[PDB]
Design goal:
Layout: H1 23-30, E1 33-37, E2 43-47, H2 50-57, E3 62-63, H3 97-107, H4 113-117, H5 120-141, E4 145-146, H6 147-152, H7 154-164, H8 171-185, H9 194-209, H10 215-227, H11 232-262, H12 272-285, E5 295-297, E6 301-303, E7 306-308, E8 313-316, H13 318-322, H14 356-373, E9 378-379, E10 388-389, E11 397-398, E12 402-404
Parallel strand pairs: 2-8
Antiparallel strand pairs: 1-2, 3-5, 4-12, 5-8, 6-7, 9-12, 10-11
Helix pairs in contact: 3-10, 5-7, 5-14, 7-11, 8-11, 9-10, 9-11, 12-14
The chain binds protoporphyrin IX containing FE (HEM) and the ligand CC[C@]1(O)Cc2c(O)c3c(c(O)c2[C@@H](O[C@H]2C[C@H](N)[C@H](O)[C@H](C)O2)C1)C(=O)c1c(OC)cccc1C3=O.
Protoporphyrin IX containing FE binds next to helix 11 and helix 14.
């Protein structure tokens, strides 16, 4: 029924900064709704048109329910987010309908942007200490600071950990361990995570004992109210998820944002408005997540002219719609003064990113620190020699970002 392009939608060779994988253009040329080959077997359908994508992502017939995914995917697709049944109610990405609204209710007050903003000075301090350490190591060594491994994931990880009351001192070890717990929680096979698990449980114990209106306290109070009774293990599971959600995507994006700033594309006298417009363009141009998470048709659906069967796995093309010439003049150029137009980098519909305000705050705070404390920071290699890639369902990321910070 649909036009068919017989390729894996996740195919990604090593890319330059300015280019996006060829599959996006081949899908868009085929039609608004394109059959493709799902990586773990059978068909999948990609949505290549912005307006249609917005309709799909708000249509209750397309659901996250991982039980609708083909049998062949279980244990293999790894892009499939499939908690054990009893943990799906605690997993924002695994539910829709009333169960999803409940979790949105629990998370909303915890991400109150007024409360995040009170943390700006701490966020700056975090970034500034990480950068001073990196500059000092480069002074001693004679080697450029490598900001992907030394900054991009560490900075957002330390922010979200501190917001949740989880006192991490080694972000590299924490990043590895929360990755393991994420994979286990979302249904992967099967390594030592006990140190991190101790800190997560300590943050939950502390949330229950103390009335201080922090993030984890508010999650606790609101989950207790909605579920009647919530266990320490359930809260640990929920905060594990927000640690991973809060750092991986953000850290992938920040590597790209850093590259564009350090390439000298931000005006030297840029005011706050110009900075936030620069961040906005970077979110259009370098989305870390190329497709929405899997949705499945709950019934037979005809959409954009095409008949999709019950069970049909559907992807919205974020990277391709963000760089569609039908809505963006010179879609593959980086133009921060471009008129502001919508993008799909944070999703749409009920499952829209709950972290967007935080990710923005972190972005603009990082640039402030850089501009004020490392005004001469530059790339240690040309912008045209930077490369990025992604395998499978992982976020897009630079291979490295070598910088002379001062
Ligand atoms: C630039 C950084 C980030 C980007 C690009 C990003 C992108 C996205 C996208 C595309 C989705 C929706 C997925 C879908 O519905 O298919 C989403 C959801 C989500 N994000 Fe973000 N995100 C970012 C930062 C953050 C941060 C800082 C947090 C904090 C914990 C967060 C937590 C979440 C959560 C929990 C969801 C699930 C919402 C739902 O299913 O209801 N994210 N993100
Ligand atoms: C793009 C936004 C995002 O999907 C949000 C998100 C998320 O909301 C949750 C968790 C996440 O891991 C993620 C992220 O998802 C991963 C896995 C996906 N297959 C895909 O590879 C994507 C790029 O990364 C990011 C959790 O891992 C999780 C959890 O893990 C055990 C426990 C409770 C809730 C969540 C929970 O809500």
């Amino acid at each position: 029924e649909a036009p068919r392009v017989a390729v894996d939608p996740f195919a990604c060779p090593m890319m330059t900064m300015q280019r996006k994988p060829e599959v996006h253009d081949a899908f868009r040329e085929a039609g608004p709704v394109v059959e493709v080959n799902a990586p773990a077997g059978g068909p999948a359908w990609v949505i290549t048109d912005d307006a249609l994508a917005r309709e799909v992502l708000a249509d209750p017939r397309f659901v996250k329910d991982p039980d609708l995914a083909p049998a062949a995917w279980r244990g293999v697709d790894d892009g499939l987010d499939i908690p054990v049944p009893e943990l799906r109610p605690f997993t924002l990405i695994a539910v829709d309908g009333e169960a999803h609204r409940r979790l949105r209710r629990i998370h909303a007050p915890a991400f109150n942007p007024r409360r995040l903003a009170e943390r700006t000075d701490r966020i700056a301090a975090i970034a500034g200490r990480l950068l001073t350490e990196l500059a000092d190591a480069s002074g001693r060594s004679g080697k450029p600071a490598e900001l992907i491994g030394g900054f991009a994931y560490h900075f957002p990880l330390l922010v979200i950990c501190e917001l949740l009351g989880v006192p991490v001192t080694d972000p590299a070890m924490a990043r590895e361990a929360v990755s393991v717990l994420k994979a286990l929680g979302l249904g992967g096979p099967q390594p030592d995570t006990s140190a991190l698990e101790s800190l997560l449980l300590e943050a939950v114990h502390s949330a229950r004992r103390n009335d201080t209106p922090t993030m984890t306290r508010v999650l606790y109070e609101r989950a207790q109210a909605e579920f009647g009774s919530v266990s320490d293990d359930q809260l640990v599971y929920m905060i594990t998820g927000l640690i991973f959600a809060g750092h991986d995507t953000t850290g992938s994006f920040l590597g790209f944002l850093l590259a564009e700033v350090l390439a000298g594309r931000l005006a030297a006298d840029a005011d706050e408005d110009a900075v936030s417009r620069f961040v906005e363009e970077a979110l259009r141009y370098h989305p870390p997540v190329p497709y929405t998470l899997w949705r499945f048709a709950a019934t037979e659906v005809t959409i954009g002219g095409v008949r999709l069967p019950r069970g049909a796995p559907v992807l919205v093309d974020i990277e391709g719609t963000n760089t569609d010439g039908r809505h963006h003049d010179a879609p593959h150029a980086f133009h921060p003064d471009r008129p502001s137009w919508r993008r799909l980098t944070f999703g749409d519909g009920p499952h829209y990113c709950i972290g967007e305000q935080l990710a923005q705050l972190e972005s603009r705070t990082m640039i402030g620190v850089l501009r004020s404390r490392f005004p001469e920071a530059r790339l240690a290699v040309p912008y045209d020699e930077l490369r990025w890639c992604r395998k499978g369902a992982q976020t897009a990321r630079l291979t490295e970002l070598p910088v002379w910070l001062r």
